[PDB]
Amino acid sequence: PRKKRPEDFKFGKILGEGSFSTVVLARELATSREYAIKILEKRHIIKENKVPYVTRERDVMSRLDHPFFVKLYFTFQDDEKLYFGLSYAKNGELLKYIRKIGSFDETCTRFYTAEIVSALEYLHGKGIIHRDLKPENILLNEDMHIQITDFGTAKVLSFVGTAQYVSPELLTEKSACKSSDLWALGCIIYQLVAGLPPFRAGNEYLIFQKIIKLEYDFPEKFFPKARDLVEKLLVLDATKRLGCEEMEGYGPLKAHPFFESVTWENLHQQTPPKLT
Ligand SMILES: CC(C1=c2cc(NC(N)=O)ccc2=NC1=O)c1ccc[nH]1
After folding, report:
1. Where's the active site on this chain?
2. Catalytic site positions
3. In CATH, which of 3.40.50.10160, 3.40.1170.60, 3.30.200.20, 3.30.420.10 is domain 1-92?
4. CA of 252 to the centre of ligand 1 (A)
């Protein structure tokens, strides 16, 4: 399949923006297919010593083959830029729905929580750790199933993620592992139910302080079995988190009572509950 060029596309609006990339919507002219093309400036990447992060993202996304992950269709480059052609997830980021509808009911947190848990099992089975799992990195497709993205900063068996989601082992020995993604899972569950993340404060140092002290509280309206799960996830000792190897893996995590009624085997075949 001949390599594609910038001229093969009609480019449109900006979809997203980070410190090193811009994601733009594009229509392939020969097929009228829409893609989310991520553009990176080679000079800026180099001067910031990011080449290893860019090659890792490409290499990881090449290995993923599961419906709960954004897909890499093609790459090319011109003189100044790299181009990564990715899935266009029509409905955008999960963070927008948490803001829009404010807070999920138990049916919806349970379903979306389970899709994220299936995703992490697949990722971790490939020996890959995300290290920056968060609502902004969890997208929704036109049919309202999730697609996880942003793999530049992953570790395939140094880096700290987003303040509100970093685990306590990062704030000490500065190490990360599978248990780290499970800590962020517990944070995202909390945020699904309560509408806000567990550890908030006026600046980043104050957040890091709260995390090591495990200083947070549950609302009274918080679903009980979902509170019990969050408590088995937000644990300071990483080896004691539900779903980690030392706790015997995903078997026990999926068996939790909050997931009582879930069929784990075909989630992306199921119709998602409406958000309200
Ligand atoms: C931001 C965004 C999309 C992406 C962001 C991405 N960001 C990233 N850092 O990798 C990656 C892929 C992607 N596909 C999208 O459709 C989006 C917004 C609205 C619809 N899609």
Report:
1. 132
2. 132
3. 3.30.200.20
4. 32
Tokens of 181: 């993604």
Site to substitute for ligand 1 among 71, 82, 86, most atoms within 8 A of C-beta:
86
Contacts of 54 (CB under 8 A, 6+ apart): 40, 45, 82, 152
Helix, strand or coil, per DSSP, at residue 249: coil
**Which alpha helices (H) appear in the chain, and where do they start and end?**
42-47, 51-63, 94-100, 106-125, 178-194, 204-212, 224-233, 250-254
Pick among 1.10.3720.10, 3.30.420.40, 1.10.510.10, 2.160.10.10: CATH of 93-274: 1.10.510.10
**Of 44, 47, 37, 48, which is closest to residue 14 (Cα–Cα)?**
37
**Substitution candidate for ligand 1 out of 15, 142, 162 with most atoms within 8 A of CB:** 15
Q: How far is the CA of 124 from the centre of ligand 1 (A)?
A: 22
**Other C-beta atoms lying within 10 Å of the C-beta of residue 272:** 17
**Residue 37 CB contacts under 8 Å (≥ 6 apart), including other chains:** 9, 11, 23, 24, 25, 26, 83, 84, 85, 86
Residues in contact with ligand 1 (CB, 6 Å cut-off) = 15-16, 18, 23, 36, 38, 70, 86-89, 92, 139, 149-150
Technique that determined the structure? X-ray
Place of tokens 């990360």: 176
